[PDB]
Amino acid sequence: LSPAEFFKRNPELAGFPNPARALYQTVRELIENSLDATDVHGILPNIKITIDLIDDARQIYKVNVVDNGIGIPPQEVPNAFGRVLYSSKYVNRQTRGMYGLGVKAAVLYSQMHQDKPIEIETSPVNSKRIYTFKLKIDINKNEPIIVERGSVENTRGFHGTSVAISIPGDWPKAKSRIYEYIKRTYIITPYAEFIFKDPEGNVTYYPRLTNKIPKPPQEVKPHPYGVDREEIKILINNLKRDYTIKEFLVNEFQSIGDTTADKILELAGLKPNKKVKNLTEEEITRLVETFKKYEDFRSPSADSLSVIGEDLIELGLKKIFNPDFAASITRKPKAYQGHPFIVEAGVAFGGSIPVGEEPIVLRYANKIPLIYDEKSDVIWKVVEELDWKRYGIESDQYQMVVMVHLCSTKIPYKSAGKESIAEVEDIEKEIKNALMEVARKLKQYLSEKRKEQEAKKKLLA
Numbered sequence: 252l253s254p255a256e257f258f259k260r261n262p263e264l265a266g267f268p269n270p271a272r273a274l275y276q277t278v279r280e281l282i283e284n285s286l287d288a289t290d291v292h293g294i295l296p297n298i299k300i301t302i303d304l305i306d307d308a309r310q311i312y313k314v315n316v317v318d319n320g321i322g323i324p325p326q327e328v329p330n331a332f333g334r335v336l337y338s339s340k341y342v343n344r345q346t347r348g349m350y351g352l353g354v355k356a357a358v359l360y361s362q363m364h365q366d367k368p369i370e371i372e373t374s375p376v377n378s379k380r381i382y383t384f385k386l387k388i389d390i391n392k393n394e395p396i397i398v399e400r401g402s403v404e405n406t407r408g409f410h411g412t413s414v415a416i417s418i419p420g421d422w423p424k425a426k427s428r429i430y431e432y433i434k435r436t437y438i439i440t441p442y443a444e445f446i447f448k449d450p451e452g453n454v455t456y457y458p459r460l461t462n463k464i465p466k467p468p469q470e471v472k473p474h475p476y477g478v479d480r481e482e483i484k485i486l487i488n489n490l491k492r493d494y495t496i497k498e499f500l501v502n503e504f505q506s507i508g509d510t511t512a513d514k515i516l517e518l519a520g521l522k523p524n525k526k527v528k529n530l531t532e533e534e535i536t537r538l539v540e541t542f543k544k545y546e547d548f549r550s551p552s553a554d555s556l557s558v559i560g561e562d563l564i565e566l567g568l569k570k571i572f573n574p575d576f577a578a579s580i581t582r583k584p585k586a587y588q589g590h591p592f593i594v595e596a597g598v599a600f601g602g603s604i605p606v607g608e609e610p611i612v613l614r615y616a617n618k619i620p621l622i623y624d625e626k627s628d629v630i631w632k633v634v635e636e637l638d639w640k641r642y643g644i645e646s647d648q649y650q651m652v653v654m655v656h657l658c659s660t661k662i663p664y665k666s667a668g669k670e671s672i673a674e675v676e677d678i679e680k681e682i683k684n685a686l687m688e689v690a691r692k693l694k695q696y697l698s699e700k701r702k703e704q705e706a707k708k709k710l711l712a
């Protein structure tokens with residue numbers, strides 16, 4: 252089965268189990284693409300989200316997201332929305348989203364269940380025109396249908412993209428989590444500005460708090476430990492030139508210089524000067540084996556990642572929660588299974604945060620909030636296992652928010668269609684190390700606060 256056909260038969264595994272989640276997920280995919288279109292490219296995100304109930308009896312909603320990002324070259328638009336790829340591309344740059352189909356899952360669901368086309372308007376940086384489309388995915392042929400295509404004259408300095416998708420939804424069911432999704436995005440994106448207008452006509456405004464944008468992720472070449480047979484054939488098939496196996500190793504991968512390639516070639520039983528387009532199955536097998544076994548690669552480069560940053564984590568926590576204290580940490584990068592990863596953690600304490608018997612726990616993966624399935628997440632487990640009395644929290648009731656961000660070019664999820672990060676040992680170890688680091692900052696704060704109260708009580712009239 253193709254991913255498109257696997258989606259159609261198993262949409263509950265892809266974040267579309269029912270209309271309430273479809274509505275939520277569509278909003279997510281559009282917001283995530285709008286952010287990747289803006290901040291990855293040095294642009295402060297100015298994003299408008301509207302949701303309208305367009306057919307009351309059938310509970311059809313139109314979701315419209317508008318951004319100021321870099322736009323889509325018109326020639327790429329039909330395949331971007333209307334052609335599901337036959338396999339996921341190897342990830343070489345950090346991007347927002349759990350789901351391989353991205354917006355294409357919203358488009359499929361739209362075309363499966365109702366009759367309006369998708370509406371797209373886009374203007375690439377410096378374009379003299381805005382390109383407009385009404386589009387469908389052919390649900391049988393997995394190909395775009397262009398219903399309407401046109402353009403209008405652009406205005407000074409305008410660039411970006413508008414997408415509207417009509418779909419079955421359930422606003423009353425989805426409402427609180429859509430709001431929470433947006434809030435939690437805003438917390439770690441205080442340089443974005445959002446406007447959200449809901450189906451009931453409520454308007455929420457999330458103003459820009461800063462103009463500081465974190466360093467973007469950069470494309471890297473794949474790390475040898477991350478690739479299997481199929482991925483190597485893909486790399487071979489994609490070559491524009493007639494590289495030798497040696498040239499292939501040195502130029503298509505991370506961490507293979509001249510000497511390393513030589514050693515790899517020797518261990519693999521390959522001729523350096525054989526043309527790599529001629530690699531046989533047996534030869535690929537030995538190469539992959541040699542890759543898995545080789546002990547002398549540098550770690551996967553973290554150049555492909557982008558953190559939120561301690562400064563922004565703290566600013567977001569403080570502005571949203573108005574706590575008495577906030578702290579954060581951005582850890583040094585680690586790696587696993589051929590991909591780099593970074594953990595960040597944050598804590599906000601006291602002030603306007605509600606009293607509870609447990610912390611408010613915020614989970615992020617590649618800068619997207621995880622919303623469902625929180626009790627099965629490795630992040631939830633770590634926070635729950637930590638003994639807060641060791642870090643200065645004395646009462647059974649307290650006001651605390653804890654956040655953890657994992658970013659990687661390969662986030663491990665427990666189950667398709669669930670929003671929980673898997674309990675991978677090396678990732679759990681690092682999340683725990685991060686949390687402890689921030690918790691020590693909190694312990695210091697509480698110890699200083701307590702000494703100060705004691706001093707006033709005992710020494711001041």
Ligand SMILES: C[C@@H]1C[C@H]2O[C@@H]2/C=C\C=C\C(=O)Cc2c(Cl)c(O)cc(O)c2C(=O)O1
Binds near residue numbers: 288
């Ligand atoms: C090509 C550009 C910039 C890329 O960074 C964006 C990441 C993913 C985008 C995938 C798309 O299919 C086009 C797109 C969509 Cl669907 C959207 O909802 C909002 C957008 O702003 C863009 C866009 O302009 O995409």
Ligand SMILES: [Mg+2]
Binds near residue numbers: 284346347348
């Ligand atoms: Mg995405």
